[PDB]
Structure 1
Amino acid sequence: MIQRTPKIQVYSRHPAENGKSNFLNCYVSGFHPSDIEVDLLKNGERIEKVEHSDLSFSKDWSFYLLYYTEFTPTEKDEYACRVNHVTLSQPKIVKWDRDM
């Protein structure tokens, strides 16, 4: 049974500007099987009411999803995306970096 572990990108829709409203995205791709758990975190805690795209897949059959939420970035607030998948022995947390 083939398994492919997620690529994970965490990033904003628009270039980040402190105190300015934006969207926080977590894009998970290249994975199989399709069952996955994705949370967006604000200062280590899970943000509620996060939305996601409908399941679709690439030419190599691997899956991709986008998870997203409205956010207003600030100097000090830390954001992240936490991902669990069958391929991971523990959930992976990828920190938001405004330069990536």
Structure 2
Amino acid sequence: IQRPPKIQVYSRHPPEDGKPNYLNCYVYGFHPPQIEIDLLKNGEKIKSEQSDLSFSKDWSFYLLSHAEFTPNSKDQYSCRVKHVTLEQPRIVKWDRDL
């Protein structure tokens, strides 16, 4: 029981300032299943397009939240996850050089 979530913030296509992309936040390997995931632009939240809760032997419970977004050299994004294993909501930033 009590397993913290593993997170992956990434974009669908290699980003270029201008072309509309998609930002996905992959969260998995956690338990219990109740978990909240917010997508953030400069600190405030955006498109809550979330998948349906799924489970697997190899990654326990997992989810995928995504939003359409347009890259700029000034706007920064990140994924915020809230789970009973995190004393304070964990925030992972979208690094676009990884």
- TM-score, L = length of structure 1: 0.93
Gaps of 5+ in 1: none
Aligned Cα RMSD in Å? 1.1
Secondary structure in structure 1 of the residue aligned to 2:95: coil
Deviation at residue 73 of structure 1 after TM alignment: 0.8
Aligned length: 98
Distance 2:9 2:56 in 1: 19
Deviation at residue 57 of structure 1 after TM alignment: 1.2
What residue in structure 2 maps to residue 51 of structure 1? 49
Distance 2:25 2:58 in 1: 21
Distance 1:61 1:14 in 2: 24
Equivalences for residues 1-100 of structure 1 within 5 A: 2-47=1-46, 49-60=47-58, 62-100=60-98
4+ aligned runs moved over 2 Å, structure 1: none
Secondary structure in structure 2 of the residue aligned to 1:80: strand
| AA of the residue aligned to 2:27 | V
- TM-score, L = length of structure 2: 0.95
Secondary structure in structure 1 of the residue aligned to 2:79: strand
Secondary structure in structure 1 of the residue aligned to 2:24: strand
**% identity of equivalent residues:** 77
Distance 2:3 2:58 in 1: 11
Deviation at residue 20 of structure 1 after TM alignment: 0.8
Residues 1:56 and 1:66: Cα distance change in structure 2 (over 3 Å): same
Residues 1:7 and 1:15: Cα distance change in structure 2 (over 3 Å): same
